[model samples]
Target chain A: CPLMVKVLDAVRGSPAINVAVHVFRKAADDTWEPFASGKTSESGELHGLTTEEEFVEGIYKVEIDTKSYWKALGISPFHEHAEVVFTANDSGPRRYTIAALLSPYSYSTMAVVTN
Target chain B: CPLMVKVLDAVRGSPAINVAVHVFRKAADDTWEPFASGKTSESGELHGLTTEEEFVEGIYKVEIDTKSYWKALGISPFHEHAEVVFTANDSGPRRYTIAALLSPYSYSTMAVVTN
Candidate 1:
C-alpha cells in the first residue's frame, strides 16, 4: 500500500496540475529528512512517496511549493509553502490518501486511511 | 448559537494573538461581500460573524491576515492570507467552531458543527 496525495486549485475548483510535492519523514533525532519528491500529474495525483519503502511508523510531513505554483499562474504567491504533518501509525501496507485543496488565499486538506 | 473561529501559530505552537480576522458571505449574485471583521484576542478566538444576524444558510468564508501575522513575528510573510470556506446548512441557532492552525510554511484547519 502507498500513500497518495492529491492537489487542487480551489478557485478554479479543479485538480492542480504540475504542482511540486515533497514528502519528509521525521527521524528519531527529531529531524525531518526528505523521503520523496515529485509533481502532481494532469489529474492532480501523486503516489508512491512511501509505498515502495520499507514501512516505517512515525511522523510524515508534506510540503507544497505554493510560491512556484502561484508564480506559474502569473500572480504574486500568497503562500510561500503549504505543509502538512501527520502521524502514520498503521500496520503494513498502510494506504492513505491526502487531498489538498488550495486557493490563492486559502487551503483545505483531508487525509483518510485506506485499506 | 454562533460561528466562532480560532487561530494558532504552528511553529510557536500557541494561539496567534492579535491577528486580524475577516468573514465574508457569498451573495446571491455570486460575489463575495464582507460580512464582519475583527482581531483575535489573547486566546486567538473570534465570534459574532454570523451569530448575531438572522442565521442564513449559504457559503461563508473566513480570511486571516497572514502577511501581517508574519510581519509582526519579524519574518518575511510566507503566506499573504489564509482563507477557509464552508457551507452552513444547519437550522436556527447553529453553532460552529472553526480552528485554523498555521505556520510560516504550512496550515491546517478543522471545522465542527456544534449545537
Candidate 2:
C-alpha cells in the first residue's frame, strides 16, 4: 500500500477538489527530489501518493499550492502555501493516510498509519 | 483573575524572553480593539495579558511580533508574526493560560482554562 491524502474545505466542510498536491522525498545527503505530483479529485482524495520505490525510511514532504487554489476560487490567498514534513521511520506502519483541512487563512493536517 | 500567556523557543526548548505580546478584544460590531500590550519577561511569562474589563464573553486574540524578536536576535524572520484567536465564553473558566511555541518557520499554541 502507498500513502494516501485527502484535502477538505474548512469553511464549507466539503471536499476541496482540483487542488494541486506535490510530494517530495528526501535523500540521505539532505537533498529533496520530486516523488509524486497530482491533484485532488471530486472526492478530494489522492490515493497512491507515493511509489513503491519511493517509500522508504526517510523524510517526506507534502505541499499544497494554496495560492493557486485561492486564485482559482477568485479570492486572494492569505498565505503563500501549506506544507507539511514528516519522517517515515523504519519502525512505523507501511501505509499512511494524511488529511488536510484548509481555509483561506489557516490549515491543519493529521496523519495516521493503516495496515 | 486575569488571562495569562507564555512564550517559548521551539528550537532550544526554553523560555523566549523579551518577546512582544499584544492582546485584542473583539467587539460586537466585529471590530478589534487593542486591549493590552506588553513584553515577556526573562521567564517568558506574562501574568496579566488581559484586564478584568477586557475579559468578557466574546472572542479574543493574542499576537506575537515574531519578526521583531528574530530581528533583535540578528536573524531574518521566516514569518511575519504568530497569532492565535480563541473564544472566551461565559460558561468557560474565568482564568486562562495560553502557551505559544514558536520557531523560525512555524508555531503552535495551546490554551487551557485554569481555575
Candidate 3:
C-alpha cells in the first residue's frame, strides 16, 4: 500500500487551463502502462490516483502538458515546451508522496516515501 | 545553516555534456540574485550548496542547461527545454535538500529539509 496523494499544478489561482496528466509504469519486461489519467483542479492540482498504487513497485513517471497549460494563459513559456519527469523510490513502506508547484518560468516538486 | 545536497543530471552515463546549473535568490525587493553554479557529475548530480543557505528565508530557483544536455546526447529532448522549479518552506531548520536525475528526454528532482 505504498500510496499517497499526488498533486499537479500550474500557476496557482490561474484560470482553468486544460492540462493532461499521464502516468506510466515500467513493467517486469521493462514496458510501461498508461495508467492514472486526470487534469489539474482550478487551483491547478490533481489528487487521488487510487489505481496508480498498483504500479508503484517499479519505476513510475508522470508528464505534464505544460505547453498547453501555458498557451491557455496567453503567455509563451520560455521553459522548454514539453513534459517533465520525476523519480520515485521503487520499494518502500505503504507511503509515498509527490506534490508540485508551478510558476511561469520554473517548477518545484517534492516527493517523500516512508519505509 | 539551512542547506543540503543538490543533484542534477542529463541521461545516465552519457558522454560529455555541458549543462549549466544556476542558483538564484529572491531579494527583499523581489529580484533574483544569481548564486552557486556548477555542472553535474558524470551521473548528472550536483550537491553541497553551503553558500546557498543565506537565501533560505525567501523564494529561490535553479535552472539546468537541459537543451544543451540533450544536444550533447545527440538526441532531441521532448521534455521542454527550460528549467524546472520546486517549492521549499520559507521557514525551516538548517537542512533542506534538492536533487535531479536527467535523461535525454526528461529530468527528476528531489528536495528535503530538516527544521
Candidate 4:
C-alpha cells in the first residue's frame, strides 16, 4: 500500500492563518479527481486524505493553500504553493504516505518516496 | 467527535529527517496512551491519526521529532517540538482535522479549532 499524504502550515507570531488543500489523483480516464480535502491544523499540517483505500496505484498531485493562507499577514511566499507529485504502489485497501511543511518565504515536498 | 491529530516534519536541503508521533488523550485514569503511530512524509506533514472516531472531547497533546530530524542537517531548532494542545468536539465517527509544517529553526500550530 502507498503511504498517506500529510501537510503542515504555519506562521511566525501568527495563528490566524488559513489553509485549504485539494488532492488530485490519476483517474481511470487518465484524469484527476478531488479525492479528498483537508486544512491545516494548529501545528500547520494539511493532511488531506485520511486513507488511500480507494486510490489507484500511480502518481498524485497536491495543491496547497499557501498563497491566500498567509496573504493577510502581509506575507507572500516564494512559491504560491508547494506542488507535490508522488507515486503510490499498492493494491486493495492499501496504505500510502505523503507529508509537507510551509512558511511564508519557502516550502518543500518529497521528490519521491523516502524509502 | 474530537478532531484528528496531525503533524509535519521538515528541513532545508535535508530529506532523511524522521518523525514519530504519540497521541496522549485524557484516559479514564487521566493518563495517556500511544494511540496511533505515523512518521514524517517528504513534505513534512505527519497526518498521524487517520480517523477521530474513537477520540473523545477534551484536550490532546502532541510531540514532534525536531532535534534528531535536523541533527544530520547541522541544524538545531529553537524549540524541541512544537507541542500542539487542542480540544476536540463531536463524537461517534465524527470527522476532525489537524496539520503542521516545520523548517530548521521554526515551527507553529493552531491553538484552537479553525471553525
Question: What TM-score would candidate 3 get against the native?
Answer: 0.44
Query: What value of lDDT does candidate 1 attain over all alpha carbons?
Result: 0.74
Docking verdict class for candidate 1: incorrect
Candidate 4 lDDT over residue span A1-115, tens digit each? 3434445554542233346777787777988877677765664444436454466677678777777776756776677776776676653343445545567787645432443
**Span of ten consecutive residues with least summed lDDT in model 2 chain A:** A7-16
Worst 10 residues of 3 chain A by lDDT: A78-87
Please write out the lDDT profile of model 3 over residues B1-115, one tens digit for every residue.
4443344444454433345678776667866678676765654455565454454555556666665666665875534333444344444533555555555433555555456
| Top lDDT prediction, candidate number | 2
Query: Per-residue lDDT tens digits of candidate 2, residues B17-44?
Result: 9999898989878999898888999999
Q: Which residue segments of model 3 deviate by more than 4 Å? A: A1-115, B1-18, B79-89
Q: List per-prediction Cα lDDT, in the order shown.
A: 0.74, 0.78, 0.53, 0.57
Whichever of 1 and 2 has more DockQ, that candidate is 1
Better of 3 and 4 by lDDT: 4
Better of 1 and 4 by TM-score: 1
Q: Which parts of model 4 are misplaced by more than 4 Å?
A: A1-6, A9-17, A46-52, A91-97, A111-115, B1-115
DockQ of each: 0.06, 0.04, 0.05, 0.05
